[model samples]
Target: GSGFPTSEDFTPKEGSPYEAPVYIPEDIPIPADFELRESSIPGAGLGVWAKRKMEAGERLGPCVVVPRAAAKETDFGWEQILTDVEVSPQEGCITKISEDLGSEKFCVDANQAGAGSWLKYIRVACSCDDQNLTMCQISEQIYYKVIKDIEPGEELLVHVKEGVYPLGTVPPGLDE
Candidate 1:
């Protein structure tokens, strides 16, 4: 007989799956001044770019917050959430999704899991060298303020969160 125990339950080749999107639907409403394209960072996935001249202090769109339990790691818009983990990636922490003060309790993962706001596409830079935009919660909403004047076609970059891992320390599937 072959060198195998064919009767063993191990026959099921697929065991506990390690687990792991496609194109965003058209009309994602990324905002008139911003566009979504391949990230400038290697393996970083989609990134945000300036469609027009953006001046300092100007902010991008608002947050679409969602609770932690419901958010799926597969969602590209997972970054907005921050309770103490990376959860997923490509996010902007718009802690202020609600109008009530201190209601930032919910993180910014729009459409409940992620979407409905332009905040999802902006890249997270690990250092000041790539940071050009800053996330600000104001008027009781999540917004990204341009720290420096930005030009057309310039990719808008936001600073990293406490868990960001640049220089190849990301959780396997991330970019440089």
Candidate 2:
């Protein structure tokens, strides 16, 4: 009459249930400033909101490049770009970094959402470009696509895509 049985009493029938615990290696470290906020506001689940108005082609933070299975057997087939590259950059902001700062935290990008959130749902949160919205109601959906000339004190965003950057790259997942 025990609700749960111990390993001694446990038994597995033929082709009963296959319980293979998946282990996603935690070898990688999270990027910097990338925190997991709750998902009760606008866009549910994990999302990257705009922190500041971004300039076109601006370096929006360093792309946390990682390797994928498809890139296992190619020349120069390293997974992602580890060197300090683009981080969060304002739209139209054309500042690019060329130094690897090493992993300090984990940040999310579009690839993490797959088809779950809209392409524009990549939120980072910012108030740079004369746009004033309370932080309490700040949601990824609230702000639209990133535009050039983001004002000061705004959060910049980086959109992730396949073949967008160098090969063997993996970005962070949603915020929360």
Candidate 3:
């Protein structure tokens, strides 16, 4: 509920309708090659910026996935679910990774550990344009690749459409 769910929160609940899977909180691992820093956006509370140059097809890092239970899926109705789960700059970098895993009952979350500088600041760009293409998602991992090149201090951007998992690609059943 706070920074990350405590171990006690992960204990199996007796008579629980769903045996919610537990994902222990851990620091998001970022690559050493990248240098990340936080900066203020005009309207967006905080954003990540590049500290050095990066080439196209470069991987930023893996997203830190939170268990379906930890994300509190049942707390909201259909309309509120999207806004409730999407990353907010004020929320310290968090994103919803999967929707309705197995059945429509479960979902997955990815949150930044501390100041998730790398993936946190990558802004969402329009997919219709080709020159602005910056990042892509293959499964749960977000790879940062620029169509041209990213210079120091340039904010990284990715197409928003690439974040969601493709339809029918989600394996059936919760165990998958």
Candidate 4:
């Protein structure tokens, strides 16, 4: 039991009950344009807020994502699923994948349990009928953008239906 134990001492022997805790590493980086904070709306919890004024059609930043296989499901359904066609980490939006898609689908979970970013706080909002809306999703990687001029301290919102694609379409792009 001295000098950091030998290999034999660490190995579990037969008929022994020893389980090790799994160690998962966090790797995603947060963007400089936004900051994470508690949301003002009741039941909204946390949200991402702008750090400075931005223009319409301006590109925000990519959402930090991990492979579906790397994530574990939690009690709350905070995971955003992606498909095989959408695995390019550099260019995909946060999305909920359909279960019927079978094994070809991959997922991107954004739970606080992992390397989640402010993108998780971009609440779902719609303004298709309104001419003065600001936020929208440009592609799978380009998580969100300002559809109209946005002021500092304004929370970014998007029309989820407009950004969601058909189950089999080419993966959305960050620059496209």
On lDDT, the candidate that comes out on top is 1
Per residue, candidate 2 scores C-alpha lDDT tens digits across 43-155 of: 22344433444455333332323322223233222233233343535887443763333354533342232232232333433333523221110111111334455554444
Q: Candidate 4's residue-wise lDDT over 1-176, tens digit each?
A: 22343467456444544443342243345544566655565523455667866777665555533354444342111124443354546456545663332345535222223234546566544233433322332232325555787677766454243335322123344223
Instruction: Predict model 4's lDDT versus the native.
Output: 0.46
Top candidate on TM-score is: 1
Comparing 1 and 3 on lDDT, the stronger one: 1
Candidate that beats the other on lDDT, 1 or 4, i.e. the better one? 1
RMSD of each: 13.7, 15.2, 17.9, 15.2
lDDT of 3 by residue, 1-176 (tens): 23343457566544533423343243345444344444455533333455667666554545433333244343211112223443346665454553333444444222222234346566643233424444443333335555666677555454333324322222223233
Model 1's alpha-carbon lDDT is: 0.52
Off by over 4 Å in 3: 1-29, 43-45, 64-117, 125-133, 159-176
Report how far off residue 63 is in candidate 4 (Å). 1.3
Q: Return the clash pairs for model 3, or none.
A: none
lDDT of each: 0.52, 0.33, 0.43, 0.46
Q: What clash pairs does model 4 have?
A: 91-141, 92-140, 92-141, 93-140, 134-147, 140-172
Which portions of model 2 show Cα errors greater than 4 Å?
1-8, 12-28, 43-45, 48-58, 64-99, 102-176
Model 4 lDDT at residue 93: 54
User: How do all models score by TM-score?
Assistant: 0.45, 0.25, 0.36, 0.39
Tens-digit per-residue lDDT, 86-159, candidate 1: 45454765454545423476443233322445566666553556567555543333456677788886665553
